[PDB]
Design goal:
part of a larger assembly; 3 chains; A alpha+beta (120); B mainly beta (95); C alpha+beta (116); A: 120 residues; alpha+beta; 3 helices; 46% helix; C: 116 residues; four-stranded mixed beta sheet; 4 strands; RNA-binding; ribonuclease P activity (chain A); metal-binding (chain A)
Amino acid sequence: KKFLEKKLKKIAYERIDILMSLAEEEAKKGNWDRAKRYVYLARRIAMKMRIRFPKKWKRRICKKCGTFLLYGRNARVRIKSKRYPHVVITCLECGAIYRIPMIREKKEKRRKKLEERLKA
Amino acid sequence: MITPHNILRHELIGLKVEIVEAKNKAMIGIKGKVVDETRNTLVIEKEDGREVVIPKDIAVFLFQLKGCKVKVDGRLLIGRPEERLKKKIKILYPY
Amino acid sequence: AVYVKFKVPEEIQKELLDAVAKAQKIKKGANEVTKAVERGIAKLVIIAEDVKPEEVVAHLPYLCEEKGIPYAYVASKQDLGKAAGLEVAASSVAIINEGDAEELKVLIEKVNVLKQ
RNA sequence: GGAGAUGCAGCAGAAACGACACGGCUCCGGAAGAGAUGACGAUGAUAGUGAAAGUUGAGGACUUCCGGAGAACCGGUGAAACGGGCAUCUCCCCUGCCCGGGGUGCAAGCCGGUUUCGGCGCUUAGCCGAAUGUCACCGAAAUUACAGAAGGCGGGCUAUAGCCCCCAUUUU
RNA sequence: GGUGGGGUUCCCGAGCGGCCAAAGGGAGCAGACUCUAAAUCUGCCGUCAUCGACUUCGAAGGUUCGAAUCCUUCCCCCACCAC
Ligand SMILES: [Zn+2]
């Protein structure tokens, strides 16, 4: 007999998904403080459950203030790859600026191009 | 999915709710969704447009799931939902 | 596989490629597509499904969901690169002026039918 | 407030508490392609800024890799990072007050007795095989809830009966 | 009235803030073994009962990235005291 198929960490991951989806759904209405409360509760349950953030909702939030970042409204997203490949998220509310360095994927593409050169 | 057994640990925010019994007479008859949740308090926005502050331990709640309607005391919902999903065991005896 | 929202049929994918081939007045590269959907001059966004790293296009669809410009996906990036006019692949193409295929992008408004 | 030491597991990240080795940047050596050709380039090209960041966006265009050494800037991770935090322990830098320092504790300690007992400590209540009883009433603070002395006094914690005062939600 | 302490699996008992880390022993079940049985060994060991994963460390609150563990409170269990 199997009554409990869903464990504590599974319901924790479901609460992560539901809370951050409701954060996105409520952040577009005009209440950024309610969305900050959702991100704060999701971050508190992430540090409490010792579970990692999903890669979908990972870069959509700010670590300093906690505002859910709408790209374009209160978040400026620019891709610069002259010196090193990076995608920069800029919070318009407080001013915290984060980025996405892509050096090792460029290294993998570079090794694939070296293999295509040496085979040819 | 949200189950009637794990509704003691599922998140209450984002679910329609009505209360059926309470000691406050004017509390009976409200219908709305859950927005904010603290240790023994729900902040419920009515369909009419009024925000109400409902204590949990004085009333019983009927949560509307995907088709389901589950009646749970707020005495079972004691604690912040953070600590409630940590682990909260509540055993109630209405003698 | 992650940033994609809906499954794209192959026929409307070929319609997207034919629209990119017929337009030839476009913004290629994700920076110009992002600027075009922030300004609102773009009428159609085409995003490749095989983009690795995904972050280069991961800001693209939800922003369109904020701005109301119809966006759609193609499976290969090198085919979009050859349709845009380059020997090397392109991640995303925004269309400013369609021209002779303008009625065609009306059919790509049926992507909204795929949205529901 | 400062110094010194430890720890922030595992995974991830270049890196988990002092700074660093590492990759983007500069130089040198080797290999491969090439002079109206070809390599590369919207997963970004000659390209600039205090190079976190932002403006730029292509008959643009002379390149790419590996290994070694160095002035400045930068870390996809995580709660927390070329840099500031957290907690513990020990010292020295202050201000004011007080001078015997520790250890056991009244079932301590002392006496008749010399195993075992009685007396002092011991009471404006003072038992020890642990006394403080019952009813009515003024009042409304009352024997009703938690609940009982054991050498005494002072501080703090725990649990609530009756009235008074103060604060909050529903309400009108 | 007083001091030095302990509460973890059915019972006796360990355990650095960290992957059921939960040492374990005895017990139950199953395997193995034997003509049968004892002893020895192996897995479940609380549950699904093949790997593996989840819950319980007397109870509550709080600190923390995270509690058997660190702090506070509520408890109980020991040992010995009249001379
Ligand atoms: Zn902000």
